[PDB]
Amino acid sequence: TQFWFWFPLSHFLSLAYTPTCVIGLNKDLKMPKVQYKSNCKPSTFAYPTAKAKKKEKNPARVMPAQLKVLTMPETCRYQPFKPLSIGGIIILKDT
């Protein structure tokens, strides 16, 4: 807020940096291969559509608004047992 009293307070803005993401990992150390569609264009993915491709856990990005438009793949061997609505790491069941 005020770093003009002490300059380290401007370098204490380093506290505002925190990691956040979503994960499609099934379980344990095994990394599944899963690709599911998304209805949002790459224009949101650009960092200066029919179907998209998301990981397949490294995971893939999603916007909080893009969580509702994505649907779990029905043709994949690995399908989630829990309904997928919001982000975060969720379980993925192998068929």
Q: Which residues bind other proteins (CB under 8 A)?
A: 2-7
Cβ closer to other proteins: 13 or 21?
13
Dist CA 31 CA 9 (whole Å): 41
Least distance from C-beta 28 to other proteins, angstroms?
51
Q: Are 59 and 41 in contact (CB under 8 A)?
A: no
Nearer to other proteins, 5 or 47 (CB): 5
Output the CA angle 26-24-82, nearest 5 degrees.
70
Considering beta carbons, is residue 10 or 49 the nearer one to other proteins? Answer: 10
78-79 and 93-94 beta bridge pairing? antiparallel
Q: Please, what is the minimum distance in Å from the beta carbon of residue 9 to other proteins?
A: 9
